[PDB]
Amino acid sequence: GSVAPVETLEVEKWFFRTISRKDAERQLLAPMNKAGSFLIRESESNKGAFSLSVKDITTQGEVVKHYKIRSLDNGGYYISPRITFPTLQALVQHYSKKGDGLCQKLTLPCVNLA
């Protein structure tokens, strides 16, 4: 195209592997990040399911979030049954414009160096 196609593996602080629960949470809960940085970790039990942590900001201290991602044979991923996606990038992208499903939309993934 134009100085780009040359080993461009995507590994941003959004599409993570099956990090531990508290781990993904430890990262989001970092004071560098806030509501919007996410972790879509894979459920290391199911051959196709995932999970997603987001920082939640409440008066009862700063926490994370937990949204269950399913994998449909003809619907990619879905968290709210009123809205399905083909991959998590298109899921996260859609949620990157508003807070349709999540109460706090996506801003910026987590910072490097946990």
Curated annotation (Swiss-Prot):
Expressed in immature Vgamma2 gamma-delta T-cells (at protein level). Expressed in the B-cell lineage. It is found in: Cell membrane. It comes from Mus musculus (Mouse). Induction: Expression increases during B-cell differentiation and is under the control of the B-cell specific transcription factors PAX5 and NF-kappa-B. It comes from the Eukaryota. Residues 14-110 form the SH2 domain. This is Tyrosine-protein kinase Blk. Belongs to the protein kinase superfamily. Tyr protein kinase family. SRC subfamily. Transmembrane segments: none annotated. Disulfide bonds: none annotated. Interacts with CBL (via SH2 domain). Interacts with CD79A and CD79B (via SH2 domain). The chain holds residues 105 to 218 of 499 of the full protein. Phosphorylated on tyrosine residues after antibody-mediated surface engagement of the B-cell antigen receptor (BCR). Ubiquitination of activated BLK by the UBE3A ubiquitin protein ligase leads to its degradation by the ubiquitin-proteasome pathway. Non-receptor tyrosine kinase involved in B-lymphocyte development, differentiation and signaling. B-cell receptor (BCR) signaling requires a tight regulation of several protein tyrosine kinases and phosphatases, and associated coreceptors. Binding of antigen to the B-cell antigen receptor (BCR) triggers signaling that ultimately leads to B-cell activation. Signaling through BLK plays an important role in transmitting signals through surface immunoglobulins and supports the pro-B to pre-B transition, as well as the signaling for growth arrest and apoptosis downstream of B-cell receptor.
